Structure formats: structure tokens, C-alpha cells
Coordinates of C-alpha atoms and ligand atoms in Angstrom, one line a residue:
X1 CA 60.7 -16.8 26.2
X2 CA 62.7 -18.0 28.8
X3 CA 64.2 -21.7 28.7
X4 CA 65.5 -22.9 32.4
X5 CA 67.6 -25.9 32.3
X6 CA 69.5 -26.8 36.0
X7 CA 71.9 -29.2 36.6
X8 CA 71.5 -31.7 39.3
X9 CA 74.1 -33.8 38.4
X10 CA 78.0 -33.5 40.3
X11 CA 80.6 -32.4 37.9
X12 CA 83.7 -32.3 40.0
X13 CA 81.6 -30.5 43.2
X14 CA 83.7 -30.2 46.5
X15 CA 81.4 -28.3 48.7
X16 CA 77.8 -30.0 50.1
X17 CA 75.1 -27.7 49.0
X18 CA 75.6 -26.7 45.5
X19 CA 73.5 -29.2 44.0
X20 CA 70.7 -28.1 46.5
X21 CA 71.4 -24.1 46.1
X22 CA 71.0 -24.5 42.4
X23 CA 67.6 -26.6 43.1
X24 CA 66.6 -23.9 45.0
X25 CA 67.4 -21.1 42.9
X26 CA 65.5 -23.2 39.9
X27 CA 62.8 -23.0 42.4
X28 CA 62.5 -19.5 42.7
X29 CA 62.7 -18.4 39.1
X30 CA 60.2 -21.0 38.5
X31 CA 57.7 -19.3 40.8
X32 CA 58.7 -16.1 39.8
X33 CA 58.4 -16.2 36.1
X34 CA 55.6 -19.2 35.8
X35 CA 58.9 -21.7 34.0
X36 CA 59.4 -25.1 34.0
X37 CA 63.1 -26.2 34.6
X38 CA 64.3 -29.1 32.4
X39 CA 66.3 -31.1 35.3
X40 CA 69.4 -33.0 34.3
X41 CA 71.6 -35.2 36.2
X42 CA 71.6 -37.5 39.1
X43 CA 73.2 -36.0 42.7
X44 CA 76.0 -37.8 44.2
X45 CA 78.3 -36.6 47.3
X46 CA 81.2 -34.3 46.9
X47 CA 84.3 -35.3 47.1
X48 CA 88.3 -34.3 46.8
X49 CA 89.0 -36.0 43.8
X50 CA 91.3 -34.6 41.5
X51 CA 90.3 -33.3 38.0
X52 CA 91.3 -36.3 36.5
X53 CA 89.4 -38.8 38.0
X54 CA 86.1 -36.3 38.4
X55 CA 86.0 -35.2 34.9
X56 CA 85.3 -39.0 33.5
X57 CA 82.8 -39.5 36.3
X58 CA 80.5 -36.3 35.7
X59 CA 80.9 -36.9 31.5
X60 CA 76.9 -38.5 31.4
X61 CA 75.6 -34.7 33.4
X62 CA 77.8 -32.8 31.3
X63 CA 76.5 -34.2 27.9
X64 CA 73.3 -34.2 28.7
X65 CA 73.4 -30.4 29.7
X66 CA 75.1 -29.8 26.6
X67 CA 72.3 -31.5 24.3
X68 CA 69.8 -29.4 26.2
X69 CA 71.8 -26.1 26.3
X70 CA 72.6 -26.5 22.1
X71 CA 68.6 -26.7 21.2
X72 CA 67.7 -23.7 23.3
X73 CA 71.0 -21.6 22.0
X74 CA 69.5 -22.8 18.7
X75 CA 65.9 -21.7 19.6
X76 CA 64.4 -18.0 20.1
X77 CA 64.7 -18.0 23.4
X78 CA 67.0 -16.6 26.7
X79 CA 69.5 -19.6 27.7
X80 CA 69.0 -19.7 31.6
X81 CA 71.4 -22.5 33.2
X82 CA 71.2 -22.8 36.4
X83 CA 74.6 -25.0 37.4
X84 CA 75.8 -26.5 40.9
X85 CA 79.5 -25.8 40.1
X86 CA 81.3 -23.5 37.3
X87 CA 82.2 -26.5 35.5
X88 CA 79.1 -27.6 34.2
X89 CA 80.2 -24.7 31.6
X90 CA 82.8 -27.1 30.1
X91 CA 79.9 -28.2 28.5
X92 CA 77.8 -25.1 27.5
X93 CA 81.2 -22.6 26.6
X94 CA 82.1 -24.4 23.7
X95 CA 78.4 -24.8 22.1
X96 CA 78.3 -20.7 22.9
X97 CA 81.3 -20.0 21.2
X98 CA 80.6 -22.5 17.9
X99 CA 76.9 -21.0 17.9
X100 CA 78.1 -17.3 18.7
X101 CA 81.9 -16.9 17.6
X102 CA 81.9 -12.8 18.2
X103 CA 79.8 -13.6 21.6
X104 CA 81.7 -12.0 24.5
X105 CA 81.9 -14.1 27.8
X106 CA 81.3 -12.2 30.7
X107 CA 82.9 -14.7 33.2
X108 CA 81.5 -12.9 36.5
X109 CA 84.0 -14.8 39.7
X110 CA 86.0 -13.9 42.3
X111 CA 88.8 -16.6 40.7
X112 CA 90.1 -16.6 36.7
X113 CA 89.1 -20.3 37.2
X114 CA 91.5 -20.5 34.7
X115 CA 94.5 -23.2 35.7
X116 CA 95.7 -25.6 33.8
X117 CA 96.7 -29.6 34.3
X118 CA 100.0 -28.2 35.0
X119 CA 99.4 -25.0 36.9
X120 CA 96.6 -26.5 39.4
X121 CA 97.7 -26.4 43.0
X122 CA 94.4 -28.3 44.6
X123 CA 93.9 -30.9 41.1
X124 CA 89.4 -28.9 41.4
X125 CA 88.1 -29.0 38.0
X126 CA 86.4 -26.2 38.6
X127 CA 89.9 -23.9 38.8
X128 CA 90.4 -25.2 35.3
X129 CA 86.8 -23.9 33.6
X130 CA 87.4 -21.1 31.3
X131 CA 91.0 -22.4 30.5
X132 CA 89.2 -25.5 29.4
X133 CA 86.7 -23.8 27.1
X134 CA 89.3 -21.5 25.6
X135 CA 91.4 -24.8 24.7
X136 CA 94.2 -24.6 27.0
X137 CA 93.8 -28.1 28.2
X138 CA 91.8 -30.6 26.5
X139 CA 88.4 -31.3 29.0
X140 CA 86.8 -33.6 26.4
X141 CA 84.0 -31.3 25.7
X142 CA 85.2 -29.2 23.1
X143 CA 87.0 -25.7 23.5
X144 CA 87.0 -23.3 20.4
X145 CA 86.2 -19.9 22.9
X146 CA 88.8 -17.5 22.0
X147 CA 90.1 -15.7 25.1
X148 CA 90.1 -12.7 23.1
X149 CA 86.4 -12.9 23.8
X150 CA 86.4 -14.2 27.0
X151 CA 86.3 -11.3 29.7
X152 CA 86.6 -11.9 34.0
X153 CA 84.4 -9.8 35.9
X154 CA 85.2 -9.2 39.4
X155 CA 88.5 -11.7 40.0
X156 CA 90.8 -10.9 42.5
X157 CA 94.0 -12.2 44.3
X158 CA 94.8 -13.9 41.3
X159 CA 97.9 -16.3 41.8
X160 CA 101.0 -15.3 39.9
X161 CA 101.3 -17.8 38.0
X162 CA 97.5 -18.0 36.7
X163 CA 97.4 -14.5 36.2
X164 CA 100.4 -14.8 33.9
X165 CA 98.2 -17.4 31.7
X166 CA 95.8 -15.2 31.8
X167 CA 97.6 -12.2 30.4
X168 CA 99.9 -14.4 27.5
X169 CA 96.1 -16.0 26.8
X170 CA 94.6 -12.4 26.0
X171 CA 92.0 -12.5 28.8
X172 CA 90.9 -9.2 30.4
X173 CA 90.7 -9.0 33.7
X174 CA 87.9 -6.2 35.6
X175 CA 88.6 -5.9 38.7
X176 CA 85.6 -5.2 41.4
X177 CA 86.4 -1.5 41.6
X178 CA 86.4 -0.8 37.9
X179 CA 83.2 -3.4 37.4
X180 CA 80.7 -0.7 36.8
X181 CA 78.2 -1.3 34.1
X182 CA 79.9 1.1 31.7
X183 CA 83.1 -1.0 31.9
X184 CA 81.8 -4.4 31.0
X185 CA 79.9 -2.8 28.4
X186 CA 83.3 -1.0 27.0
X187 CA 84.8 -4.2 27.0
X188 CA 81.5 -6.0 25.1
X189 CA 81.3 -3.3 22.3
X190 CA 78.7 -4.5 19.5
X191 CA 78.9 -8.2 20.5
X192 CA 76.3 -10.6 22.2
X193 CA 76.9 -11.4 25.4
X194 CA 77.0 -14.4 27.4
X195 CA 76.9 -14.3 31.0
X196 CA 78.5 -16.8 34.1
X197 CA 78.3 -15.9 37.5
X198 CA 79.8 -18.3 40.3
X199 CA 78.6 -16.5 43.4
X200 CA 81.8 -16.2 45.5
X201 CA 82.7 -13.0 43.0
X202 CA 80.0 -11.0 45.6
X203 CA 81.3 -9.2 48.6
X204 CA 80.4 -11.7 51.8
X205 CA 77.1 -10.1 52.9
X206 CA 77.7 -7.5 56.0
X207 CA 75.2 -5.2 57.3
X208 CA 77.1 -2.3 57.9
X209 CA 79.2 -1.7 54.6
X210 CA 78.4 1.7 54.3
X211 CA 82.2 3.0 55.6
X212 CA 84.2 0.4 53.9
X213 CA 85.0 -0.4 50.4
X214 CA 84.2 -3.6 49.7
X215 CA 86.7 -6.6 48.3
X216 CA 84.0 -8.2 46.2
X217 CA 81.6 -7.5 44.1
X218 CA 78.1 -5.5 45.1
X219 CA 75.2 -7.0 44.7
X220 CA 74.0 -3.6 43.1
X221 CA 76.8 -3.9 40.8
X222 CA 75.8 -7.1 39.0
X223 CA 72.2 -5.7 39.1
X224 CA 74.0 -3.0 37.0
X225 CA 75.4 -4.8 34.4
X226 CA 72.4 -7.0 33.7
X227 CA 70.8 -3.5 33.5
X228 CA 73.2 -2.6 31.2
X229 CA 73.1 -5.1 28.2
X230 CA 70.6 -4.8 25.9
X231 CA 67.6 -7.9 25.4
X232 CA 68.6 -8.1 21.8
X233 CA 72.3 -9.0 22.6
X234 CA 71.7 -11.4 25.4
X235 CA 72.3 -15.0 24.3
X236 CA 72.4 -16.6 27.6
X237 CA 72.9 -16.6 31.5
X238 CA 74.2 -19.1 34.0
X239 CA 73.9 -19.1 37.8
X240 CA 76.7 -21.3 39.5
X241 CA 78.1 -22.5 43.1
X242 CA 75.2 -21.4 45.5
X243 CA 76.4 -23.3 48.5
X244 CA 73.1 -23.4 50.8
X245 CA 71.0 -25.9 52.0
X246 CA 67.9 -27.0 50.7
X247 CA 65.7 -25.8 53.4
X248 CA 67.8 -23.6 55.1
X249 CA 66.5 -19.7 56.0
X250 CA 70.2 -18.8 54.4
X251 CA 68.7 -20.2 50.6
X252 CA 65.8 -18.4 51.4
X253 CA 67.5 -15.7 51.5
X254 CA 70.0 -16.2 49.4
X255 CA 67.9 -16.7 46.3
X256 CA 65.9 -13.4 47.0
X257 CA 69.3 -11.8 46.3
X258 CA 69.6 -13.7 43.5
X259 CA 66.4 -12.7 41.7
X260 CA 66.8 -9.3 42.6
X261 CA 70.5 -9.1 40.7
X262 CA 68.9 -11.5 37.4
X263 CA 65.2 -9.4 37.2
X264 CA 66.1 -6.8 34.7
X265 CA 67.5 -9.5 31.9
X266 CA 65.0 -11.9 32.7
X267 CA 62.2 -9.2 32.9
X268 CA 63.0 -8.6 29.9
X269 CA 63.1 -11.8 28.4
X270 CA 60.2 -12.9 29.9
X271 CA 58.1 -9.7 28.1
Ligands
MG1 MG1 68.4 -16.9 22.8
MN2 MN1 84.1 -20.4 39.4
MN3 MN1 85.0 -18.5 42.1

């Protein structure tokens, strides 16, 4: 009842190990819940290439996930993407929103990710995702989310500028501090939900966090809101921008987090 599809192939990736962290977090569900990931794409190196040059070159990955994502958002089953960057979802936010128009976006990130050709500073696609699927700019694969449904989870130190977009576009914003489980599900009301977490929304992992108040988001907290929504409502989840080596003790560990903050949707789902 769960369908795993990972992407493998480079869509705009700037940092080394996100093709690998997303291997290894296909890994562990796979183990976990008994699942066979549907692999797409062929790695390549990252690079610093601006949007317009990396877009064109990571079209073949980004159709292919989209084929794959549209049959299971069609099927019975809980969507599981597990994507090296944020912007493999210029691909699966558009199929979500056709499939689902009163779906709510959960887009769970430290960043809005939400720049434009104009208002980018560093040309990376993956500034540019949800602005993309809510049809800002044209990325070639579709748009049609309305931002009205489209909700950022955890986003902080927002550039002016973007968060101006952000506002005029309709987009709520939840900070970390108000992210408790109640308020993403006050922003959701009666709609299905889709969910996309790029990592960097969690507070960098200290030990001692017990006298501070954190920047980011908890892990706890995410583990919160995937408590929160109901099976029944849950179209789909993706897991982005892991940046650890294959191999490494840090994935290891990593991923353990990981399945700890996904287990009570995909418990669910599973049973
Ligand atoms: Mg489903
Ligand atoms: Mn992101
Ligand atoms: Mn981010």
C-alpha cells in the first residue's frame, strides 16, 4: 500500500551527496516496510549551472518521475518520492494539483524556494520550485497549483523581496515556532494533503538543546504533523536534499531520524 519511487537522476543538484542520501533513505524504507523502490534516473556530478542551462539537462529524470508519480497518484496507494533535490517536484506538483485541485501542499523548508527568473540571486533551480509549480515562471513541466493551496512549513530568513512574492501570491507562511501539529492542520482544514520536506527546514542536530529555542524545525515537530493528518487524507509524501554520503556513519544516522519522523504516515499506510 505503499508505492516508493526515488530519483537518481540530477535535476539542477549543487551539493555532492544528495543523489546518494536519497539512495540511502530508499534503502531504509525498503528494509523497514519490505518495498521495492522504482529507481529513475541516471547520476551525474553537481555543478553551478544556472537554472537555465540545468533545467533542459535534467528534462529525461524529471519526465520519467512524472510518468511514475501520475500512475501511483492514480492508483490506491500512498505516493512516497524520495527526491535528491526539491526540484524533482517541478515534475510531481503539477500532476498533484491536476489529480487533487483542493489538495493542500504542505511545503515543509527552511527556504519559500519560491524565486523567480527575475528575482533569483544564485540562477539554483531549486530556489525557484514551488514558484514554478504554482505558475509563476514557466519550468516546462506544467504549473496549475494554486498558491492559495500551497502552504510553507518551517521557512525562515526569507529575503525581502521573495517574501513579497510570496505574500502578493497568497502563500502562507508557518513559521518554526508556530509549526505545531494543530497549526498545519488549521491551515489544511477538510482537504487532502500533500507533503515535501527538503531537510535543511530541521534545526542542525545539537545535543544539548534543552536551554535554547531552536531556529529550525524539531525533529519531534515533523513527527507531529505526520501524526496529525489523517491516513484517509494523505495523497502523497516526498523526502528531498539529504546531503550524506553513501556509506558514511552520518547517513546512517541520518536516515534513522528520518524514519523515526515518516513512521506514523507510513505505518499507517503500510497497515
Ligand atoms: Mg494514494
Ligand atoms: Mn527546498
Ligand atoms: Mn531549503
Amino acid at each position: 500500500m505503499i508505492d516508493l519511487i526515488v530519483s537518481q537522476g540530477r535535476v539542477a543538484d549543487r551539493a555532492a551527496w544528495m543523489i546518494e542520501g536519497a539512495a540511502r533513505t530508499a534503502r531504509a524504507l525498503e528494509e523497514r516496510y519490505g518495498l521495492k523502490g522504482h529507481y529513475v534516473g541516471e547520476p551525474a556530478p553537481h555543478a553551478d549551472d544556472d537554472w537555465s542551462v540545468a533545467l533542459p539537462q535534467a528534462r529525461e529524470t524529471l519526465v520519467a518521475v512524472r510518468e511514475a508519480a501520475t500512475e501511483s497518484i492514480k492508483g490506491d496507494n500512498l505516493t512516497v518520492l524520495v527526491n535528491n533535490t526539491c526540484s524533482v517536484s517541478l515534475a510531481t506538483l503539477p500532476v498533484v494539483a491536476r489529480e487533487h485541485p483542493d489538495a493542500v501542499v504542505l511545503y515543509i523548508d527552511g527556504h519559500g524556494d519560491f524565486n523567480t527568473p527575475e528575482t533569483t540571486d544564485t540562477g539554483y533551480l531549486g530556489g525557484m520550485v514551488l514558484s514554478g509549480a504554482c505558475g509563476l515562471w514557466d519550468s516546462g513541466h506544467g504549473a496549475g497549483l494554486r498558491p492559495e493551496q500551497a502552504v510553507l512549513v518551517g521557512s525562515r530568513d526569507i529575503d525581502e523581496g521573495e517574501r513579497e512574492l510570496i505574500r502578493k501570491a497568497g502563500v502562507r507562511v508557518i513559521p518554526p515556532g508556530e509549526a505545531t501539529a494543530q497549526a498545519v492542520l488549521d491551515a489544511v482544514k477538510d482537504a487532502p494533503v500533500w507533503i515535501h520536506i527538503d531537510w535543511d527546514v530541521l534545526e542542525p542536530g545539537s545535543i544539548p538543546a534543552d536551554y535554547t529555542v531552536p531556529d529550525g524545525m524539531l525533529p519531534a515537530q515533523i513527527r507531529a504533523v505526520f501524526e496529525a493528518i489523517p491516513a484517509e487524507r494523505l495523497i502523497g509524501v516526498e523526502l528531498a536534499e539529504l546531503n550524506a554520503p553513501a556509506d558514511s556513519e552520518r547517513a546512517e544516522q541520518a536516515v534513522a531520524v528520518i524514519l523515526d519522523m515518516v513512521a506514523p504516515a507510513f505505518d499507517a499506510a503500510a497497515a
